[PDB]
Every structure is written in structure tokens, then in C-alpha cells.
Ligand binder design. Structure first.
Ligand SMILES: Nc1ncnc2c1ncn2[C@@H]1O[C@H](COP(=O)(O)OP(=O)(O)OP(=O)(O)O)[C@@H](O)[C@H]1O
Ligand SMILES: Nc1ncnc2c1ncn2[C@@H]1O[C@H](COP(=O)(O)OP(=O)(O)OP(=O)(O)O)[C@@H](O)[C@H]1O
Lengths: 600, 600
DNA sequence: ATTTTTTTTTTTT
């Protein structure tokens, strides 16, 4: 072509001469950074491209493919002219103006494009080709066409192996590959235009852009719109069988569950100088859920379920446990509606599911090839590495769904038996549920396992609780109609975007371990209660009555970064247990009051 | 050329008809709507000279349309066409259908269900279903099977969708059922629809250009030359097609029945103050709204006066973002047999639109989000079909709320409190927004309320049923000659057809017009008397405190929000913002009447 | 004909 005369010159005029930000533009050093990183993914921003030459926007999308090749060749001609040294061992990137799902259209094919999506379940990784070698049947001399050739034929009887070989042979060797894995698309439930058709489309990536995706997770892409190579061409039915394919140039994160702040750095000190002491059971707690009045119990409650998961392997036994577990029995009429929102934004891992009617039966392993229509789906347990399953109306789920969950709490894992493949799934996760009772809406101080009927081997694995019987208290209700109006009159501590720094650091640094500090007290909570709290509602003491306490009293102190412990914050957490445990037993209940008000 | 008959058609068309077109110019969408009466105003009644050659000659009307566009816009070969004819008199029925009705421009309607999504589809015309990519030659002699593949990049395309539609309900014959019929439509009509509308489409039926056939054992043949010195078959089936839409019946600038053209905030959104405000505050209007709407109906006459705000809007205030508020409310009716639960229940269906009459005892749980799909019908997963939420702010009242199974539980507790939608398949985890309320069609065990057991045990069903449903308003039978003879002497003229009901003085139509004017206020409530509704509810609570030894109830704050929605929509019924304290007295009065239905 | 699924009936203490 002619105009490419100018382009290469114009590229080389900026990749090592055009500079912003007070010299030494990165591109002069980016090349060598990636070179010493063995990485090969030079990146650009269209902003700086536009700062150089805004003519770089409209001779481009007559064919955006030529822009990238013309850039790749400047790369090669810059790499080895300067670094012929490492020439015995490219593609580029761009990453800035958004377009939307279902706005790419008939007209947005094969041009400058910038586009978004979300991940789900898809296939594995595989290789592709670039190069034409086939010949050797008559003479089969070395001929060597001069390109790696994508979809190219000549097929003569004359070709330089004594210009022969009209018949044909094939090679299985000296053959370039390039790995590749397929996607599945999804679209966000935040940016909903009210229940329109659910997004899933053919979209593509490549060798280097590979082995990074994860289900129900998101990544912003540059992307450019094309179609399948041949969508069902024959004189045929009353429609063509057409789909359309997108392909990835640069993949740019939408989630960032890790560190999120790139080049906030000004407010970061307020976390560890205000969420570090034992007063933070009031500072970090005043902002615990300041939405509506009732039940400050749950504010203290839910604050510490969010917090942990750990190895700390005891002596040579096994892995013991690293999970959280909550459940409540309420009544719609309770203010229990918002059951999963905010600290799952705090959560680096989690995935939602409302109740039966829409509860997961996936919660089934084969292995296939891919012809048309080959897929399988099941449980999210790899996902939720210290994440949570966010649910209401749990009591209806399937016993065998509970099997995995009991095993997750028991051996930190699930155990398939008698299948084709016997692959596994490790359980480092957390759970939330919101069921309803039997026989009504709540049964009193009478027993709790039958206040709402779960089964024997299942609930023993569960940890947290909060329960609401609720009689009247008037001043707060008048306050609440005042709250009705003034909250419907929005006529129109720890910083809010940094509290997550606490899940980063608090659980991270201080992970105390201890001898028996006074824990023969728990020998009493064993034995005395085996003789004191005897027959009212009074079985429930186990190793998990304290192992759960390791789970969460430690969280309560880990809030503080103590690193060494006496009984103080431990039993302040057991002040939840003086409050949580009391709830399950007959109105001859104050055996706990007597037996713990010193532990209060 | 015969189709110069169509040349004359568009010659005719253009000359004398020479701004929405100027609106089309940016993406060149090409769609313009024209009346079909134009064929009578100007084509001199060429309706039968025009109608039949629709897809015969529409190509040529298209051409002329583009040629019109050239007459002022610098036009290029890129231009394409749609045409959107309209105003079709003598609308035909679904049975108006044969071979013989090819190429017509018939008008029809229905609903929108069970739909499919966007999946789109030599400057010659190779776009056919009767198509072949491999062709013979252009200038020289080349092969007859070989092919190139070429510029799908500097060229002209379309976009479309697909649906199914069932037969209309103003047309409903004996025996036969609303069968399904299938269409693709062009782009500027795409995704501008939703379930539940009424139409006057273009019904231009065309055939399948099949690829293969099953049970198509009519002539099996081919256009094969004769003999002298696998094959294909042919059996098709029908479809339909379209070009133009008008969603009807669901309008406020419309001046309705009782109007004259006057001024307002909009044209005639509420322009008719001068006539309607006679019926605004003069509580004889209330008596009319008790009496001049159900002249054919007689029982308890509170239901005739408590229901009415149900049709009309609630709160929708300027409020928080954390949770939803509701305007409309849960509803029921009960009584005993032969107390005439069929008088009004159809006119529930009739009095306002989106007023869906359908039975409940037949339903499944798949009367919300149908079920799912697991073949590549559209994208292997289209699970946003439903049964309930089709109401775009409308009512879906159901019959026989008794023999139904225990699934509606999780449907409806969330429906009128949480307004969310999901299923437990391999679709996604997404949810959407309930628009609707309901009333009941309950009945007692044998009907007879023998006052010896609790209402909850006189029905003996699920628990929260009678806490969420805030108002029941039962109609119960006794043996008193006076009350039956009011009825019978209404039968005296319900068949003596002259004025054969109670004297009406306030038409349904003027009433249904004033309905929308009620919705244009946003009353805002900090009233002192409203603030003392806390005192009202406390004084209530002494009465909820009553009936608490014998027959205690399950009372909650839903009832509170109901009370305030009641007074709110009443001030909207007052044609006044700044809610009235009289609403306090009325609310307290009737709702402490609600307890009378449950005394034992 | 099999693979990946879903309900609507078939018949109930
Ligand atoms: N102590 C309280 N504080 C604030 N609001 C309350 C309180 N008690 C009751 N309410 C009100 O009572 C209503 C109860 O119904 P709600 O919408 O909470 O059902 P639900 O709890 O969401 O049902 P489920 O949790 O099973 O989905 C709430 O809207 C809430 O406003
Ligand atoms: N107060 C009344 N006003 C008007 N009509 C009445 C009244 N009382 C009784 N009727 C008449 O009695 C008839 C009752 O039978 P209808 O077809 O409504 O039964 P239904 O209510 O569906 O019965 P069920 O509810 O037990 O199935 C009605 O047609 C109605 O005209």
C-alpha cells in the first residue's frame, strides 16, 4: 500500500520521542521492561495517540486490523534493531471511552471499538494455526512459500518440486500453534434496562489473553465486532443460522477484588488508627448498620461473620476448619429484608442466590469434547475462596445440597464416590440464610431445632445466630413513622470507601495463637452444664461451641490486632454467646445467666 | 417489463407527495410511516391496484423512496429502505387467511409472548434464502462449483428479531384455540415491544423457502431436464411478516370520554377542570362512587366503597435508595357460597385495562417465569417468559386461591413486598421489578363460618397469609326476607330492560377519566394529625391488645404503611395535596371495622 | 439412538 509509507514514520516519531509528564516517556522504557519481563504485550492509550495525531481515528476503522499489524511491525523493527541480543526467543494493547451492551449493531463491525461484558462457565484451552506447509508426494522438494498463510490456495501442477505434484501430500510437523480458550459472556445486574434479553454472545480471545477468566466475573475489553467465518450458507430455511463473534485485543479488569487504587492514597491512615483498639467495638460498630433502629444485636452479630478463614494446622491431625456459618429464624414483618448487600461488596469472593423456586441444585462432573451443544454446569465451591453464598428461604433446599455443605464444615471439602471421574472441590467459603419457621412465624423458648426444622447432622456444623421474638415498644414506633416521613423526605469513624482496607489488613497480619488462657472454664461449660443446663433445652455444648469461638472471638480480637490475648476480647465475643446461645432453651433459661454473668 | 406497473405505482406515489425523513438521516434508518388512505386521497382508490403486489413491488416503492431522499439529500448507493404503511380500514380476522392472501396488507393484532432475541443476518442482490455463494463466472469461463469470499465489509446490512403470537381475545370462537404464528420484523421496530399490547400490524403472509421437509409428501419433484440419447423435495408452510405497528388501548394528553378541549400543564392531561371539578370535592360524588358504578350489584356495600383506590396509584415518593416503597396493597374477598362472587369479578377485568382475568387453581409454579429451555432455540437460554408481571403497572387478579399448592408462598410474599423474580436453572442470577397487586378468591371450608373456631383455623392454611393481606372485607349470608327482596326487586328490572338497574348519575367514563387527574399531585405528608397517627395506631393497639386472650392476631407495620397509603391515595382522591386529618378518622374507623369480620 | 435437560401428568397417607 502507499499510505503505510507515512504511518511507520509517524509511529517511530512518537514511540521514543513524543513525551508528556516531564520526560522519559514510558514507551522508551516500556519496551525494555516487557523485554526483561519476557512478556510481549506492549500497551498504548488512545488518549496519548490522540494527543499525537487525531488523524489516527478515521483512516483507521476502514480496517482496524491493519492498524494493529502496522503497529506490530514497528514493534519488531524497534525490538531487534536495538535488542538483536534477545532475538532468538509481538502483539500490542490499547486501553478509553465506553459503549454499551446492545448498542453495537449491524453498523459496528470491524472498526475502532471499545466494549464490555462479564464471564460465566466455558471451555478449556486449545491451539490454532498460522502457516502453510503442505507438499511432498512426487519429488517433494523444499519449496517454501513466503508467508505464514491463513486461508490461501494456489494449487498448481507447476510448483517448484520439479514443478510437479498436482496431486497432494500433507505435513504433521514444523507447524506453528497458538493456545486459545473459549469464553462465555454475561452482562451486569447493575446496569439493567429492565429485564431485556440476557446477554451472551460469541466473543473471543487468544493465546496470551488466556487462562485468566473465571465464572460470573467481569473484565473490560477493547474488543471489535465480527461474525463467524461461515454462518450456515446454503439455499435453505426461512432464516440464516447466524451468530456473531467478538475477539479480544486488550483485557482490562472490571472487578479488581485485589488492591483497587492505582496512580485512595490520601485517606488511608484512618483505618488502622480508628479500627485498631478495643473501643472499635464502638467506633467501627456505630457505623455497623446505621439504617433503622431495632436490634443492635445483629449489628454486633453480622460484623464478625464477615471476617475469616484460615489454616493454622494443629498437631498433625488434619486441616480443621476455615469457615463462617450463619442462620436466623424470623417472620416477614421483621425488618430482615436487606439480607446480603454491603459487606459482600466488602467480600473479595461471594456469589448470590435467593430461595427455593430459585435455589441452586447445581450447588456434576464429566469431561467432553466440543461439538455443537456441549456444556455442563454445577456448584460454585471453587469460587468463594473465603466467599459467601447469599440466600434467603433456605429451609427448602435439598439434603444432598446440604451434604456438600456439611462436608465443607467437616473436612473442609466434599467427597465424590462411585462416579466416572472422581474429581474434587475444596470448600473454603461462607454461608448466609434467612428461612422461616414451622407451624408459623416463631415458636417460643421451646426448642429451636424444631422451632424451625433442619436435621441432625447438618446444623451442628452451623455457627452464627440471631432470633427475633418481638413485642411492642411504642416510642420507637412513633420515631419510626417520623422515620417514614423524614426518610421519605430525602426530597430530590472509618471512611466509607476504605473500610475494606480492614478486611485487607486486620485478618492479614495478626493471627494470634495462645495456650489455655483460662479455658478450663470451658471444662466447666462442658461438665457443669452437663450437670447444670441439664434438661430444659440443654444439650448444646460441643467442641464447636469453642471451635466456633476460635473462629469468631479471634475475629473480634483480630479487629484489634492484639497478637497476644487474655480472656478479655475473647469473652467479649462470648458476650455474643451469652446472648446467642441463651436463645435456644426453655424459659428455665437463666442457668446461663447464673452460669455466665461473670463471663458477661 | 411488467413491474413497470410498479414503476407507475411509485411514479404516481412520489410526484404529488413531493420532515421525519430528515430525522432519519443520521444512521439512515430509512423508516417512514404513511397512511393507506393516501391510496384514496391521491392514488385515486388504487387499494386493489396496490395491495396485492406488496412484496412483488415494494422493492420498487423502496427504490422510489430512496430516489425521493436523493431529491434533497446528497444520496449514495448505500441507501436501503423500509416502509411502514398504515391506517388500514376494514381490518381482517385471523381466519381471513388462505393461499389467496399472499402479498396483501391485512391488519391484525394479539399479544407478545414466547419471543426470540436479536441475532442479525458484485454489488448484486444475493441476499435471498434462495441463495448460493458458489456461482459460475462473471466475464470469463470459470467453474460452476468454485467460489470466492469477499467484501462483507464495505456493504449494506440489516438487523431483526423473532417472536410468536397467539390469537386475539376480542375474537374468540367456539371450539378453536389461539394458535401460535411466527414472524421476523425489521430493525427500527426491534425491541420496542413487550408482552401485552394491541395492534394493527401489516399481515403480509409469505411462505418458507424450506431446506428439508418432514411429512411433506405432496409432489416430490424438481426442475430437472428430460432424458434422451441427493435430489431435493418441496413442501412448505406459512408464516407472516410486517412493516408497521400501533400499540393501542393503553393511554395523559388524551382528552377522553367526558371532555372538551381545554388547557393544562399538558394539552389535556387534566384540562377538564371546568367539568370534572364539579365532581372533585362534592361528596355526593362519593355517594355516586358508591352507587353510580355498580347499579347491577348488591351485597355488602362497603366493598363497593373500599376497593376503589385499588385501581389508582399510591405513594412513589421522593425517598431513600436503600429499599423500595410501595403504593398499592394486598387485597382479598371471602364469604360463603351463593353470595355471588361473579357479579363484579369480571368487571374487575373490564373496568380498567391490564385487568387480567385468569384462574389460579389451574396454575403451576410456572405462572411467574415459565420454566427454562435447554436446546438452541434462540441462544440455548431464553427464560424471561412469564405469566404474572406482564402488567406494565397493572393488575393480575386470580380466582380460587384455595386448592392451590404451597408454591405461591415464595411467589407472593416477595411479590407485594420485595418485587423480585428468579428461577433455579442454568439461566442466570438476575431479578426484576413486580408491577402488580392482586385480590383474592378465597372461600371457607364448607363456606359456612360456624363461629366456633379461629378464622386461621376456619381456613386452616399457611401462616403469614392473613398478615400480608391487610384487608379482607367479607360478604356473609343470613336469612332475612328484606335483604333478598332488595335483590329480587332489582331483578324486577334487571330483565325489564328499561333502566334495568339502579339509577346512575355519574358515568363510568367520566369517572375513569378523572382517575388519571388524581395521579398528578404528589401529596407530601408532615401533617400534625398525620404525626398523631402514631396516637391512632397506639389507641388501635389497645384494641389489637383486645381479642388477645381469645383469638390473638398477627399484627405488624405493613398494616401501618397500609394505613398511610390509604390516607395518601385518599388525598390523591381528594384532588388535593397536603393530606387531610379526616383520613385519620376514616382509616381508623373502617380498619377497626376489619376486626368485626374475625370476632367469635 | 445415546450425550445436556423439566415439567406435566401418572397416581398418593
Ligand atoms: N423494628 C423494625 N424496624 C424497622 N422496620 C420494621 C421493624 N419491624 C417491622 N418493620 C417493617 O415491617 C416490614 C416487614 O415486612 P418485610 O418487607 O420485612 O418482609 P421480609 O422480612 O422482607 O420477608 P423475607 O425477609 O422473608 O423476605 C418491613 O417493611 C419493615 O419496614
Ligand atoms: N347482593 C347481590 N347482588 C347481586 N346479585 C346477587 C346478590 N346476591 C346474590 N346474587 C346473585 O346470586 C348469584 C350467585 O352465583 P355466582 O355465579 O356469582 O356464584 P359464585 O359467587 O361464583 O359461586 P361460588 O362463589 O360459590 O363459586 C349471582 O349471579 C348473583 O347475581
Amino acid at each position: 500500500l502507499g499510505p503505510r509509507t507515512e504511518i511507520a514514520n509517524r509511529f517511530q516519531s512518537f514511540l521514543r520521542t513524543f513525551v508528556d509528564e516531564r520526560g522519559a516517556y514510558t514507551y522508551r522504557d516500556r519496551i525494555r521492561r516487557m523485554c526483561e519481563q519476557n512478556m510481549s504485550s506492549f500497551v498504548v492509550s488512545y488518549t496519548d495517540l490522540a494527543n499525537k495525531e487525531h488523524v489516527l481515528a478515521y483512516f483507521l476503522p476502514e480496517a482496524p486490523f491493519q492498524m494493529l499489524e502496522i503497529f506490530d511491525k514497528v514493534a519488531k523493527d524497534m525490538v531487534l534493531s536495538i535488542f538483536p541480543t534477545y532475538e532468538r526467543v509481538i502483539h500490542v494493547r490499547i486501553s478509553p471511552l465506553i459503549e454499551e451492551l446492545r448498542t453495537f449493531r449491524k453498523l459496528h463491525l470491524n472498526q475502532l471499538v471499545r466494549t464490555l461484558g462479564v464471564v460465566t462457565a466455558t471451555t478449556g484451552v486449545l491451539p490454532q494455526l498460522s502457516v502453510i506447509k503442505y507438499d511432498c508426494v512426487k519429488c517433494g522438494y523444499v519449496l517454501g512459500p513466503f508467508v505464514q498463510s491463513q486461508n490461501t490456495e494456489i494449487k498448481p501442477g507447476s510448483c517448484p518440486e520439479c514443478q510437479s505434484t498436482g496431486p497432494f501430500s500433507i505435513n504433521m510437523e514444523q507447524t506453528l500453534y497458538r493456545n486459545y480458550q473459549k469464553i462465555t459472556l454475561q452482562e451486569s445486574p447493575g446496569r439493567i434496562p429492565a429485564g431485556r434479553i440476557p446477554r451472551s454472545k460469541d466473543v473471543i480471545l487468544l493465546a496470551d489473553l488466556c487462562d485468566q477468566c473465571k465464572p460470573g466475573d467481569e473484565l473490560e475489553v477493547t474488543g471489535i465486532y465480527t461474525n463467524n467465518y461461515d454462518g450456515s450458507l446454503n439455499t435453505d430455511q426461512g432464516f440464516p443460522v447466524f451468530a456473531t463473534v467478538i475477539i479480544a485485543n486488550h483485557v482490562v479488569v472490571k472487578d479488581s477484588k485485589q488492591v483497587v487504587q492505582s496512580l485512595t492514597d490520601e485517606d488511608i491512615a484512618t483505618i488502622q488508627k480508628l479500627s485498631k483498639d478495643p473501643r472499635i467495638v464502638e467506633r467501627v460498630v456505630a457505623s455497623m448498620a446505621p439504617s433503622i433502629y431495632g436490634h443492635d444485636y445483629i449489628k454486633r452479630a453480622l460484623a464478625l461473620a464477615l471476617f475469616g478463614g484460615e489454616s493454622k494446622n494443629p498437631g498433625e491431625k488434619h486441616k480443621v476448619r476455615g469457615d463462617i456459618n450463619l442462620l436466623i429464624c424470623g417472620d416477614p414483618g421483621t425488618a430482615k429484608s436487606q439480607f446480603l448487600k454491603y459487606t459482600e461488596k466488602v467480600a473479595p469472593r461471594a456469589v448470590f442466590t435467593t430461595g427455593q423456586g430459585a435455589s441452586a441444585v447445581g450447588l456434576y462432573v464429566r469431561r467432553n469434547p466440543v461439538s455443537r451443544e456441549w456444556t455442563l454446569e454445577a456448584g460454585a465451591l471453587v469460587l468463594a475462596d473465603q466467599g459467601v453464598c447469599l440466600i434467603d428461604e433456605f429451609d427448602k433446599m435439598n439434603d444432598q445440597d446440604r451434604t456438600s455443605i456439611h462436608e465443607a464444615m467437616e473436612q473442609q471439602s466434599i467427597s465424590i464416590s462411585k462416579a466416572g471421574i472422581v474429581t474434587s472441590l475444596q470448600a473454603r467459603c461462607t454461608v448466609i440464610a434467612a428461612a422461616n419457621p414451622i407451624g408459623g412465624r416463631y415458636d417460643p423458648s421451646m426448642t429451636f431445632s424444631e422451632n424451625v426444622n433442619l436435621s441432625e447432622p447438618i446444623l451442628s456444623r452451623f455457627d452464627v445466630l440471631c432470633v427475633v421474638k418481638d413485642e411492642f415498644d411504642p416510642m420507637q414506633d412513633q420515631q419510626l413513622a417520623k422515620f417514614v416521613v423524614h426518610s421519605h423526605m430525602k426530597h430530590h469513624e472509618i471512611p466509607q470507601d476504605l473500610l475494606r482496607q480492614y478486611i485487607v489488613y486486620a485478618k492479614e497480619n495478626i493471627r494470634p495463637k495462645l495456650t489455655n488462657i483460662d479455658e478450663d472454664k470451658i471444662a466447666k461449660m462442658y461438665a457443669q452444664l452437663r450437670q447444670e443446663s441439664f434438661a430444659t433445652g440443654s444439650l448444646p455444648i460441643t467442641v464447636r461451641h469453642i471451635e466456633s469461638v476460635i473462629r469468631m472471638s479471634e475475629a473480634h480480637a483480630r479487629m484489634h490486632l492484639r497478637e497476644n490475648v487474655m480472656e478479655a476480647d475473647v469473652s467479649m465475643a462470648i458476650r455474643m454467646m451469652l446472648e446467642s446461645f441463651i436463645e435456644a432453651q426453655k424459659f428455665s433459661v437463666m442457668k446461663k445467666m447464673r452460669s455466665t454473668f461473670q463471663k458477661y | 417489463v411488467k413491474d413497470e406497473v410498479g414503476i407507475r405505482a411509485q411514479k404516481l406515489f412520489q410526484d404529488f407527495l413531493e420532515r421525519p425523513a430528515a430525522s432519519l438521516e443520521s444512521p439512515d434508518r430509512c423508516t417512514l410511516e404513511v397512511s393507506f388512505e393516501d391510496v384514496e386521497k391521491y392514488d385515486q382508490n388504487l387499494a386493489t391496484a396496490i395491495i396485492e403486489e406488496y412484496y412483488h413491488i415494494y422493492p420498487f416503492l423502496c427504490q422510489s423512496v430512496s430516489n425521493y431522499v436523493k431529491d434533497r439529500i446528497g444520496l449514495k448507493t448505500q441507501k436501503d429502505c423500509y416502509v411502514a404503511f398504515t391506517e388500514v380500514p376494514t381490518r381482517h380476522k385471523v381466519r381471513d387467511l388462505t393461499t389467496s392472501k399472499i402479498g396483501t396488507l391485512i391488519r391484525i393484532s394479539g399479544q407478545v409472548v414466547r419471543t426470540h432475541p436479536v441475532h442479525p443476518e458484485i454489488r448484486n442482490v444475493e441476499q435471498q434464502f434462495k441463495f448460493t455463494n458458489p456461482t459460475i463466472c462473471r466475464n470469463p469461463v470459470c467453474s460452476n462449483r468454485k467460489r470466492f469470499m469477499l467484501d462483507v465489509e464495505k456493504s449494506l446490512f440489516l438487523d431483526f428479531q423473532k417472536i410468536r403470537i397467539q390469537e386475539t381475545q376480542a375474537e374468540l370462537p367456539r371450539g378453536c384455540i389461539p394458535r401460535a404464528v411466527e414472524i421476523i420484523l425489521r430493525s427500527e421496530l426491534v425491541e420496542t415491544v413487550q408482552a401485552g399490547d394491541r395492534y394493527d400490524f401489516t399481515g403480509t403472509l409469505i411462505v418458507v423457502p424450506d431446506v428439508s421437509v418432514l411429512a411433506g409428501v405432496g409432489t416430490r419433484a424438481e426442475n430437472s431436464s428430460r432424458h434422451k440419447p441427493g435430489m431435493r423435495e418441496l413442501n412448505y408452510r406459512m408464516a407472516f411478516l410486517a412493516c408497521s405497528v400501533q400499540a393501542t388501548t393503553a393511554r395523559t394528553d388524551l382528552p377522553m370520554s367526558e371532555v372538551t378541549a381545554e388547557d393544562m400543564k399538558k394539552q389535556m392531561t387534566d384540562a377538564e377542570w371546568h367539568k370534572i371539578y364539579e365532581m372533585s370535592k362534592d361528596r355526593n360524588l362519593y355517594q355516586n362512587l358508591i352507587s353510580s358504578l355498580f347499579p347491577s350489584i348488591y351485597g355488602n356495600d362497603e366493598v363497593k366503597r373500599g376497593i376503589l383506590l385499588q385501581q389508582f396509584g399510591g405513594v412513589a415518593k421522593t425517598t431513600t435508595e436503600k429499599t423500595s416503597l410501595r403504593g398499592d396493597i394486598n387485597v382479598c374477598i371471602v364469604g360463603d357460597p351463593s353470595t355471588a362472587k361473579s357479579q363484579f369479578l369480571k368487571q374487575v377485568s373490564d373496568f380498567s385495562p391490564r385487568a387480567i382475568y385468569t384462574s389460579g387453581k389451574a396454575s403451576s409454579a410456572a405462572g411467574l417465569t415459565a420454566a427454562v429451555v435447554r436446546d438452541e432455540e434462540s441462544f440455548d437460554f431464553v427464560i424471561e417468559a412469564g405469566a404474572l408481571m406482564l402488567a406494565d403497572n397493572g393488575i393480575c387478579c386470580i380466582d380460587e386461591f384455595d386448592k392451590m399448592d404451597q408454591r405461591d408462598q415464595v411467589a407472593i410474599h416477595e411479590a407485594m413486598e420485595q418485587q423480585t423474580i428468579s428461577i433455579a436453572r442454568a439461566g442466570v442470577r438476575a431479578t426484576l421489578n413486580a408491577r402488580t397487586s392482586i385480590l383474592a378468591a378465597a372461600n371457607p371450608i364448607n363456606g359456612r363460618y360456624d363461629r366456633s373456631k379461629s378464622l386461621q383455623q376456619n381456613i386452616q392454611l399457611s401462616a403469614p397469609i392473613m398478615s400480608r393481606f391487610d384487608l379482607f372485607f367479607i360478604l356473609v349470608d343470613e336469612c332475612n326476607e328484606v335483604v333478598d327482596y332488595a335483590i329480587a326487586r332489582k331483578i324486577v328490572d334487571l330483565h325489564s330492560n328499561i333502566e334495568e338497574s339502579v339509577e346512575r348519575a355519574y358515568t363510568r367514563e367520566e369517572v375513569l377519566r378523572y382517575v388519571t387527574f388524581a395521579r398528578q399531585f404528589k401529596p407530601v405528608i408532615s401533617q400534625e394529625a398525620g404525626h398523631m397517627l402514631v396516637e391512632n395506631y397506639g389507641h388501635l393497639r389497645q384494641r389489637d391488645t383486645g381479642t388477645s386472650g381469645r383469638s390473638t392476631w398477627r399484627i405488624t407495620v405493613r398494616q401501618l404503611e397500609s394505613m398511610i397509603r390509604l390516607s395518601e391515595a385518599m388525598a390523591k382522591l381528594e384532588c388535593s395535596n397536603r393530606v387531610l386529618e379526616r383520613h385519620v378518622k376514616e382509616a381508623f374507623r373502617l380498619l377497626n371495622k376489619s376486626i368485626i369480620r374475625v370476632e367469635q
